[PDB]
């Protein structure tokens, strides 16, 4: 059982429904299992709507974010709590630390590099957290593949490969991040 | 020959793979460094990858520096050393220093931390952090898959059309060297 989780997102919602309402999806999810959210500050895009539901929905919602990358992420009238801090790193450490679980979900390169330093932490035992996927209309089968042919190529561990914890809806992700201990 | 750098970064692991080709183009990729008079910089793996990128630099007569947090040390650095070992204590202090050291980047095919590094240098130099190439050796379409991905983005919105042009890869070390030295 979850106390809070810090999901990966970033300022841009996807052009399709899917993905916005993929998010709108997680946050119900965080809603109703009563779970507070830790995310990268932003008040648009996937990460704007995310905090945005948890908010309404009434459960904490701390978001992390570094000083010059707010002029950036931050936009319009923020809700909820943001504990600025000093860059990148600091913003890498924030986000782990004051959260438990990672959903990476769909974004770019800076949610990419979130999932896999997650996962990375996870396969080199720095931490013992359960690392999740939300992989939407499929967004992800590509980045699924990668980490197999590191597998099968040699360079991950067939144990390591069972560190991503995939679904294509909130729903059983949630579920399978609840049935895995 | 002539380059614009002088000091090259590449991500790897202690890991060569299965498959011989890994290992045969980690001395490539030396080789085109020790040519173009490039001095190396690492993880510290004495064996992998890593192991084999080191020793060839090295070899070269360029300088090599495997900057690695000190709890990494025991569980990587084996039977020697090459060249400078930079020690630090964590993963941002190694991910800052390579980072700081590096006037470019490449990924070598490599399992979860190669990908920690190569997505998070080209996620900085999308953000305009620093102004530094992102290269890997796609060998044997290793990376395929994360090209794919990449593009995946782009169609879908969330990767525009320059950051997406910020990675630069090629099949071997020299048509990668040859594309990174021609890059803007």
Redesign the interface.
Do not use: S, V
């Given at each position: 059982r979850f106390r809070k989780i810090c999901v990966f997102c970033?300022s841009?919602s996807?052009?399709?429904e899917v993905?916005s309402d993929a998010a709108i999806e997680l946050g119900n999810e965080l809603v109703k299992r009563k779970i507070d959210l830790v995310y990268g500050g932003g008040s648009v895009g996937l990460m704007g709507l995310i905090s945005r539901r948890v908010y309404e929905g009434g459960l904490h919602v701390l978001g992390i974010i570094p000083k010059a990358?707010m002029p950036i992420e931050i936009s319009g009238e923020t809700v909820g709590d943001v504990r600025v801090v000093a860059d990148?790193?600091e913003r890498?450490?924030a986000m782990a630390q004051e959260a438990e679980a990672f959903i990476a979900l769909?974004?770019?390169?800076?949610?990419?590099?979130e999932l896999?330093?997650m996962?990375?932490?996870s396969?080199?035992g720095?931490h013992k957290k359960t690392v999740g996927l939300l992989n939407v209309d499929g967004?992800?089968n590509?980045?699924l593949?990668?980490?197999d042919?590191?597998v099968?190529?040699?360079?991950?561990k067939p144990g390591?490969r069972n560190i991503v914890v995939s679904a294509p809806t909130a729903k059983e992700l949630m579920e399978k991040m609840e049935e895995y201990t």
């Open positions: 970033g841009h996807g052009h399709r993905f990358l990148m790193h890498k450490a769909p974004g770019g390169y800076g949610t990419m590099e896999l330093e996962i990375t932490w396969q080199l720095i967004y992800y590509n980045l593949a990668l980490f042919t590191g099968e190529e040699g360079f991950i390591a």
